[PDB]
Amino acid sequence: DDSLEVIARKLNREKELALEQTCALLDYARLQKIIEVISKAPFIQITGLGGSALVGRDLSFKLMKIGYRVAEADTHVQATVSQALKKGDVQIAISYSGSKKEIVLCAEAARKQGATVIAITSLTDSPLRRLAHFTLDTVSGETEWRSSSMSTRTAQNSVTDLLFVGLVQLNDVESLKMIQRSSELTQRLK
Amino acid sequence: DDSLEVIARKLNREKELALEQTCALLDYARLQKIIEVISKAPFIQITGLGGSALVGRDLSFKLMKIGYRVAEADTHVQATVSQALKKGDVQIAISYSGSKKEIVLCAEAARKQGATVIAITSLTDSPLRRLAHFTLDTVSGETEWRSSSMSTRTAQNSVTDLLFVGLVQLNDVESLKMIQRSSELTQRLK
Amino acid sequence: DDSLEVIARKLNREKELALEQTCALLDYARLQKIIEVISKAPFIQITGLGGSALVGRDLSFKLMKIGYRVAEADTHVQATVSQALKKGDVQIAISYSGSKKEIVLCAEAARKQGATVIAITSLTDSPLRRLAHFTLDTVSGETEWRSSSMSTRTAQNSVTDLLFVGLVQLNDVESLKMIQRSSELTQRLK
Amino acid sequence: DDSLEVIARKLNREKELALEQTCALLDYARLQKIIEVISKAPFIQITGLGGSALVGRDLSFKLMKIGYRVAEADTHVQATVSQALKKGDVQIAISYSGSKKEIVLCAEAARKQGATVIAITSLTDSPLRRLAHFTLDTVSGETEWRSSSMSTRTAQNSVTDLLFVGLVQLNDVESLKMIQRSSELTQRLK
Ligand SMILES: CC(=O)N[C@@H]1[C@@H](O)[C@H](O)[C@@H](COP(=O)(O)O)O[C@H]1O
Ligand SMILES: CC(=O)N[C@@H]1[C@@H](O)[C@H](O)[C@@H](COP(=O)(O)O)O[C@H]1O
Ligand SMILES: CC(=O)N[C@@H]1[C@@H](O)[C@H](O)[C@@H](COP(=O)(O)O)O[C@H]1O
Numbered sequence: 043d044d045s046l047e048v049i050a051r052k053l054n055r056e057k058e059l060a061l062e063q064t065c066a067l068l069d070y071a072r073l074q075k076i077i078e079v080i081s082k083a084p085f086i087q088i089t090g091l092g093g094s095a096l097v098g099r100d101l102s103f104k105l106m107k108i109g110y111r112v113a114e115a116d117t118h119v120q121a122t123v124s125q126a127l128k129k130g131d132v133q134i135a136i137s138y139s140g141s142k143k144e145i146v147l148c149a150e151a152a153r154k155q156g157a158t159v160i161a162i163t164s165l166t167d168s169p170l171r172r173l174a175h176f177t178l179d180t181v182s183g184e185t186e187w188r189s190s191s192m193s194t195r196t197a198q199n200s201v202t203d204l205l206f207v208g209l210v211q212l213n214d215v216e217s218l219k220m221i222q223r224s225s226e227l228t229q230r231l232k
Numbered sequence: 233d234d235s236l237e238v239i240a241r242k243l244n245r246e247k248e249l250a251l252e253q254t255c256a257l258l259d260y261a262r263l264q265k266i267i268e269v270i271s272k273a274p275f276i277q278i279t280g281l282g283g284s285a286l287v288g289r290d291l292s293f294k295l296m297k298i299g300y301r302v303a304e305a306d307t308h309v310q311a312t313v314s315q316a317l318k319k320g321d322v323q324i325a326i327s328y329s330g331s332k333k334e335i336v337l338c339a340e341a342a343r344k345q346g347a348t349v350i351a352i353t354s355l356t357d358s359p360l361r362r363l364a365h366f367t368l369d370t371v372s373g374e375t376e377w378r379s380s381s382m383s384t385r386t387a388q389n390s391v392t393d394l395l396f397v398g399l400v401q402l403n404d405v406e407s408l409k410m411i412q413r414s415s416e417l418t419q420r421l422k
Numbered sequence: 423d424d425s426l427e428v429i430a431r432k433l434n435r436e437k438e439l440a441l442e443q444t445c446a447l448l449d450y451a452r453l454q455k456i457i458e459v460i461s462k463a464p465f466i467q468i469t470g471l472g473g474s475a476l477v478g479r480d481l482s483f484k485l486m487k488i489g490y491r492v493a494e495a496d497t498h499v500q501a502t503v504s505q506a507l508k509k510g511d512v513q514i515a516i517s518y519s520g521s522k523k524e525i526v527l528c529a530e531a532a533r534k535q536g537a538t539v540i541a542i543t544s545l546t547d548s549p550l551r552r553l554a555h556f557t558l559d560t561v562s563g564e565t566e567w568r569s570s571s572m573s574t575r576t577a578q579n580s581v582t583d584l585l586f587v588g589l590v591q592l593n594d595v596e597s598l599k600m601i602q603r604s605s606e607l608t609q610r611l612k
Numbered sequence: 613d614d615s616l617e618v619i620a621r622k623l624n625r626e627k628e629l630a631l632e633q634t635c636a637l638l639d640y641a642r643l644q645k646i647i648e649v650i651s652k653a654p655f656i657q658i659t660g661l662g663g664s665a666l667v668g669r670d671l672s673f674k675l676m677k678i679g680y681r682v683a684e685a686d687t688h689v690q691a692t693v694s695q696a697l698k699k700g701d702v703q704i705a706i707s708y709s710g711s712k713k714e715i716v717l718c719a720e721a722a723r724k725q726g727a728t729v730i731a732i733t734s735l736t737d738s739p740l741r742r743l744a745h746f747t748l749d750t751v752s753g754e755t756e757w758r759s760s761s762m763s764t765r766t767a768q769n770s771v772t773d774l775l776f777v778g779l780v781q782l783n784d785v786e787s788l789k790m791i792q793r794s795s796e797l798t799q800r801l802k
């Protein structure tokens with residue numbers, strides 16, 4: 043039986059397991075240090091391709107709203123941003139495989155300029171994991187072929203979402219003020 | 233206690249409940265009809281803003297890969313696409329509130345041209361729900377303020393992901409061929 | 423003297439010469455045939471990177487408004503679209519160098535699927551020019567280093583703009599109706 | 613006669629006149645002050661919709677390459693960035709009409725936060741011109757209906773291109789270093 047109800051139930055379980063297996067790997071002490079490193083960044087570049095780029099943009103929209111300076115989709119433009127990073131800036135490199143040439147190149151360029159590279163990647167030995175100062179692991183679990191990318195994205199978002207909440211915690215008043223101003227402005231477009 | 237471990241556990245539960253409550257509302261017979269309507273569309277426009285736009289782009293990348301003609305982010309460009317739709321085309325309008333003026337306007341324009349409007353929206357009585365030919369419900373559950381948008385996105389993706397798998401089912405051989413050709417091409421960029 | 427007034431005068435002359443030298447190469451009989459090929463395309467993909475991608479998006483917004491089905495920035499997504507093109511579809515490949523691996527790969531994939539490839543590229547012997555069924559030449563002229571990309575873009579837009587006007591000519595009534603509907607809709611967002 | 617050769621000749625003249633009439637309005641002393649204000653900005657947001665957004669992105673890619681921190685297309689995201697600007701940051705608001713509600717709202721929000729607003733807009737009395745600290749004028753000239761948007765874009769790019777060259781002048785060594793690093797990186801993707 044391959045009914046839509048069976049598919050929905052199986053996919054929700056696949057996503058639950060990706061959330062569980064990804065969370066199980068977290069080093070929470072080290073995650074807090076990563077959050078503080080991001081909070082001090084004068085500029086943050088989030089890199090990625092495909093679904094990983096969308097995960098990165100989803101985080102970027104929230105970071106922008108709460109006041110971070112965040113760099114877009116074009117891989118060659120991304121390379122130009124990476125070479126312009128400076129000491130204290132942060133690159134968040136989102137790549138499940140950790141082996142996309144464009145993302146590896148941007149991580150190499152950012153590190154060479156003295157920026158801090160934080161990789162969000164699968165639990166595998168990749169060029170990106172070898173370049174990053176810190177790596178946060180994303181595990182999709184054993185997925186069915188039709189839903190591999192969706193469960194991967196679920197795992198990736200579980201990490202970026204936690205980064206966002208941790209950043210809100212460090213600057214709660216300003217975050218609340220900026221959320222309120224943002225809501226007031228967009229409500230004027232109704 | 234507001235430790236990162238507590239936050240992660242609570243957020244994963246919030247997401248599990250959003251998946252559960254969204255799936256519980258599905259009419260699976262009607263979902264199959266919606267999937268078949270999409271499968272016959274000569275052109276599909278996916279509309280949305282903010283996080284809903286990212287959910288839509290995530291679905292769009294997968295639909296493009298398996299051969300669908302899919303329309304981008306600019307709300308005024310979206311309006312120009314909506315007025316150019318024709319009978320048989322489909323608009324998938326993704327808006328949790330269902331009350332963003334730009335999205336409502338695009339749905340009105342698409343319907344006027346004879347296109348089919350499928351809304352993906354919260355369980356509320358909105359202008360978008362009143363304009364759509366079919367509505368699929370997305371329920372975030374009762375969320376904490378720091379994670380409301382993330383659990384909403386989880387619920388939205390649960391619906392779009394099911395649409396994707398249902399579309400693969402209807403054209404499995406061609407979908408597999410296109411996935412293979414796509415993988416071969418992108419591997420050449422390694 | 424490197425005053426802003428001198429810079430502005432020199433840049434305007436550089437752009438005038440790029441328009442002139444690009445127009446001088448046009449084969450107008452062959453351009454009309456290219457326009458008719460585009461007008462018959464059930465689906466059009468416009469590929470490019472960097473500034474060439476922006477030139478392509480500028481054309482795409484206008485084509486969408488007048489009713490064409492047009493495919494975005496992600497180079498790996500572009501590859502997935504190219505492999506899904508069919509006989510009768512058109513790829514407009516915009517690349518000044520004609521040697522960006524991603525664009526060459528997409529042109530190869532489109533041609534393999536039977537689609538028609540129209541290259542918009544510099545007057546040089548490139549892999550893209552060798553793959554295209556038709557090539558339209560864009561000449562920047564001899565540019566100063568600070569403005570090379572701007573004069574290149576001016577030349578590229580001179581070709582795409584002519585394609586747009588030629589397409590309006592072939593379907594003038596429908597184009598006017600769609601422009602009016604588009605204007606009416608966007609004015610409602612004022 | 614409405615041949616493609618006649619169209620091309622007329623469009624090139626229309627563009628030449630837009631460059632001429634836009635340049636004729638420049639106050640070069642005030643332009644130099646605007647360039648210096650931009651050069652000191654810790655963060656620059658470029659706003660716009662439609663073709664104006666593409667003009668802004670074209671400038672943004674160049675500014676990013678030479679080291680500026682630059683904010684994207686979503687109008688509601690743009691609003692969230694505008695409310696997060698600070699004293700010393702710059703908003704470059706590109707809108708020919710100067711009356712798009714989204715752009716006016718972002719300019720109001722940026723000014724309220726103490727940021728400097730530079731408008732690039734038509735020679736008309738608009739809400740945006742009334743909000744901006746500095747306005748640079750873009751004149752399309754008297755255009756034919758089929759090419760109004762293209763000549764407008766030509767005029768807009770003439771202003772942004774001059775801003776870019778002026779910024780290169782103020783930091784020539786660093787600009788050259790960053791151009792070289794950028795070229796070396798992207799050549800590795802060949
Ligand atoms: C046809 C294909 O496989 N496209 C893939 C796409 O699915 C994938 O999301 C993207 C990014 O991958 P990553 O997370 O860096 O490992 O890389 C593209 O190449
Ligand atoms: C500052 C704010 O509230 N921005 C919101 C953004 O969070 C939200 O994702 C976007 C779309 O909303 P919808 O799903 O259509 O109800 O609408 C914007 O206005
Ligand atoms: C640092 C650099 O050179 N970036 C370039 C960018 O300027 C250029 O617009 C883009 C596309 O080039 P093309 O028109 O295909 O020859 O390719 C990037 O690599």
Ligand SMILES: CC(=O)N[C@@H]1[C@@H](O)[C@H](O)[C@@H](COP(=O)(O)O)O[C@H]1O
Pocket residue numbers: 308312604605608661662663664706707708709710711712715761
């Ligand atoms: C159907 C239509 O008119 N779309 C327009 C588009 O052509 C235009 O580029 C965009 C921005 O205008 P602006 O430069 O701010 O005056 O505003 C949209 O509404």
